[PDB]
């Protein structure tokens, strides 16, 4: 969370399994897998998404649990950066040519 040091709110980060459908509402995301990430306490919440392979995948949605509460001095609109890597160890087998290069 790259907002102010005075901005405070909650975000609800839901994960859908690879077969399941996306939550259409915040309540339906709360009934599945989620983490109510309090911004005012910690500013960096870490996941670890399993069952990621190919040879119809999951979803990382994010919801307003609460709005961003801000004092009169700090700005109202903030940003959230995301990151991604291999969680513990990663398995990979069959080398090929990349599609990007032409």
């Amino acid at each position: 969370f790259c907002g102010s040091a005075m901005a405070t709110g909650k975000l609800l980060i839901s994960y859908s399994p690879p077969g399941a459908s996306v939550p259409t509402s915040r309540k339906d995301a709360m009934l599945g897998t989620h983490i109510v990430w309090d911004i005012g306490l910690q500013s960096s919440c870490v996941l670890c998404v399993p069952w990621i392979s190919q040879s119809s995948a999951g979803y990382i949605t994010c919801w307003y649990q609460t709005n961003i509460v801000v004092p009169p001095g700090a700005p109202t609109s903030c940003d959230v950066l995301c990151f991604a890597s291999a969680c513990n160890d990663f398995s990979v087998r069959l080398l090929r040519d990349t599609p990007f290069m032409a």
């Binding site: 109510v36 306490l41 910690q42 004092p71 009169p72």
Partner: protein
Amino acid sequence: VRSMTLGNSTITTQNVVVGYGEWPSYLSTAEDQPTQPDVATCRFYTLESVQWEKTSPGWWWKFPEALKNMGLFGQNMHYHYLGRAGYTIHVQCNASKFHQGCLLVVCVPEAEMGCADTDTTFPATELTTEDTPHVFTSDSITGKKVQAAVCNAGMGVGVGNLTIFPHQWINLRTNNSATIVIPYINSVPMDNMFRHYNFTLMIIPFAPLNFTDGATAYVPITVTIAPMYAEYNGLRLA
């Protein structure tokens, strides 16, 4: 900062008021045998966040049936007609440093509320709207509904001395979070979860919210309930 987790629900927290000095527990017969779900049920059910403005008089939720549409706990209410639970209730406020105010977070077992115009009753959809809270009012009201004026919260008592119950103050000067554990107060070991409202979580702002013309015009209050030690009747033969 402690990141509690239960099942597939993790919240982020920042002292617990154990209601009546007791921690919820199981009931411990072959004539009547309880079923202990344990699986799921115990996860955190975060309700919808409630915006607290300068003119908000209060709110109340009536449990156990406030969770009647909340997942497996709200689905085991329809298959078993007897049950009991513990309901750890976290109440955050995540206001700023320039906001001021104070809340009474109290649980009030057996809150029998009174109708607005006496000599009649209310249509039973005025006590509870499952997930969403019924607000109080600042003055007296009429009509076939609950007399929801503060200073006489629901029961005809003074609202100031509502502190006799399991309570917690949320003074935005000092703290923001409250947590209450309510070990199933009832006169029968198991009761139906749709007829009987075991307790009434009501959040009442004593000192009103105040701020200046730059802050956000509200403070969202977040309510989270974890049904602990929920056990039900048996469905199998003996």
